[PDB]
Amino acid sequence: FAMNRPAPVEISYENMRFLITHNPTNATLNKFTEELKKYGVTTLVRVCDATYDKAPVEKEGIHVLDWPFDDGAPPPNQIVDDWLNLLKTKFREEPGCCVAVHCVAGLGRAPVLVALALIECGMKYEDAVQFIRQKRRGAFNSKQLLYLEKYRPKMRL
Amino acid sequence: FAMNRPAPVEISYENMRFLITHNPTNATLNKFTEELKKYGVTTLVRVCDATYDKAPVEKEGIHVLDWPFDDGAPPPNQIVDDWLNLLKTKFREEPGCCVAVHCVAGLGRAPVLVALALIECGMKYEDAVQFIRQKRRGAFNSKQLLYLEKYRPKMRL
Amino acid sequence: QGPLNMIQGVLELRCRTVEDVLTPLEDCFMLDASTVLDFGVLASIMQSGHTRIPVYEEERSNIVDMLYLKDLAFVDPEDCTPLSTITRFYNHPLHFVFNDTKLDAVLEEFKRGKSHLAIVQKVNNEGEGDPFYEVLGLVTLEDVIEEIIR
Amino acid sequence: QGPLNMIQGVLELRCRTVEDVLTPLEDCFMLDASTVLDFGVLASIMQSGHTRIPVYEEERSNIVDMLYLKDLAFVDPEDCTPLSTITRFYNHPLHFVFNDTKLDAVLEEFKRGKSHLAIVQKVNNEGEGDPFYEVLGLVTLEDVIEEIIR
Ligand SMILES: Nc1ncnc2c1ncn2[C@@H]1O[C@H](COP(=O)(O)OP(=O)(O)O)[C@@H](O)[C@H]1O
Ligand SMILES: Nc1ncnc2c1ncn2[C@@H]1O[C@H](COP(=O)(O)OP(=O)(O)O)[C@@H](O)[C@H]1O
């Protein structure tokens, strides 16, 4: 405990499974995809701009999705609707697969989307943050915590 | 205190003055003589065999005397008589000069000769050893301590 | 004085945090990733008297790999071998500690583990933007000791 | 457990002696004076993970100078520069401690002084011959610490 690594993080819940990841370069692109295969991700959502070629990752058969939105903001309503619809279809395709989200800061807007998923799958807003922050300390800013509080399930997974 | 150096040692008493020294090579011969000039020695007594040339030391005007005797033995009676006669003449030549003695172990037979000098200048056998061992720990072996005990002043300095 | 002062030292390990003991970034010996290992930089390494040296690109707060002394083993000065080649010969692990962390934990983990070196993060709340971990500098075993023995 | 175990450690510094804590000669990284500094021995130095390395001629118990890491600064491997040239570029001081010496003294002197390294002597009574100081090995600051923190 109390010491850690520049390293992926996993959140599991029902048969949903999520990975939050570092940025690569092209320099360690081929190693990066091998991490992802190891967690059995079918799907990457880039929520922050990156410069690497995605097509090595896509060649090895992971669906890669470029959905960038503003630094430290809530996701716009399109992106949440997309993201929920994506999760339906991709856990329909394979139960107990993983969906990767990654940014260039692993705290912030990548875990927001995971917390959005967890809330519309069960657990309380209070509870949902706690599971995230246990795994990556200090996880959202106050605007995101606002949005995560003011958020309502349908409950559409 | 309690940490020390590969380094000369001084014993003073009346206007007698003595240096006990390490061995040099030729490699640091020229530095070695500069130590000796710094203590103002006129006289070196080699009491253990060494290989260096003495003539650099003798050129810089120190009387060098090759008086070797057996490892861990008392000095033979010639050597003591010589050594005492040397001390007379050389403190006659210059009061408050230093006489160097050196071996290849600075504990042992070099400090015996200094203790011989101190005994025939005053101080008690018990006292004489103590001044030596304070300066270089563990200074004589038992044969030498025997000889230093059984030793009698005339008192011929 | 003395041993009594030291005993208070070990007693205050539970109080005191990494923040108190660290070497801050501006006093860290580190190299740019793009550095070449010519005669002079190799000299500069071997002058620095450190065995583990952090490697950054291209802002200093962005630590990326570690260089070990052992990594330098058969390098020829002006091969001019660049740094990131040598950092790419090895996985050396890089460990991160939080600035919160009490010293007695840190000491026990150093007692356990692989490297004598962690690098130091705090979280970062002010900012409009995303939260990030902010690099403060280095803490070693010898850092934690110096609390006790002074 | 723990900090309580450490406090006994500092309390036993007055009891325990250098004899108990030292690295004995047979486990010391040292070089012969006549060694040449080619690629391999330089590699061997930088592998050894030591910054201060004793130098002997020609029995191992006869320590003569110290090599520092900083001494290696602008040497070219296969110049083949021999060791004793580099040891002759510098007075580095070499410090000697007695095997008797209690740890709390040693720790305070290390707290003071120049080198983190002393080398260890006992006197030698058995033998027919002259008394001599007998070289046992090395003690460092990190040695004395390890008493406390274990
Ligand atoms: N690469 C480095 N740059 C700057 N300071 C360092 C570095 N490595 C260690 N230190 C500092 O040096 C001190 C002692 O470090 P130590 O544990 O002896 O490792 P090293 O052998 O690298 O010096 C500590 O205060 C530590 O913060
Ligand atoms: N030249 C050397 N050869 C063998 N062991 C050494 C040497 N220098 C230090 N040590 C040992 O390594 C341990 C820690 O040494 P440390 O104080 O970290 O110095 P270094 O940075 O040289 O390792 C101690 O137990 C010490 O006895």
Numbering used by the authors:
A (entry chain A), B (entry chain A): -1 to 155
C (entry chain C), D (entry chain C): 297 to 446
Provide text from the study.
Recent reports have shown PRL phosphatases bind tightly to the CNNM family of membrane proteins to regulate magnesium efflux. We report four new crystal structures of PRL proteins bound to the CNNM3 CBS-pair domain that reveal the effects of cysteine disulphide formation and nucleotide binding on complex formation.
We also crystallized the PRL2•CNNM3 complex in the presence of a mixture of AMP and ATP. Electron density was observed at the CBS-pair domain dimer interface but it was intermediate in size and could not be fit satisfactorily by either AMP or ATP. Accordingly, the density was modeled as ADP. While it is possible that ADP was formed by hydrolysis of ATP during crystallization (see below), more likely, the crystals contain a mixture of AMP- and ATP-bound protein. The nucleotide ribose hydrogen bonded with Thr319 and Asp439 while the phosphates associated with Thr347 and Thr436. His346 mediated π-stacking interactions with the adenine moiety. A putative metal ion was identified on the dimer axis coordinated by Glu438 and the nucleotide phosphates. This site of nucleotide binding is conserved in other CBS-pair domains including the domain from CNNM29, 10. Other than minor rearrangements, nucleotide binding did not significantly change the conformation of the CBS-pair domain or its interaction with PRL2. Superposition of the free and ADP-bound CBS-pair domains showed a shift of 0.6 Å over 144 atoms.
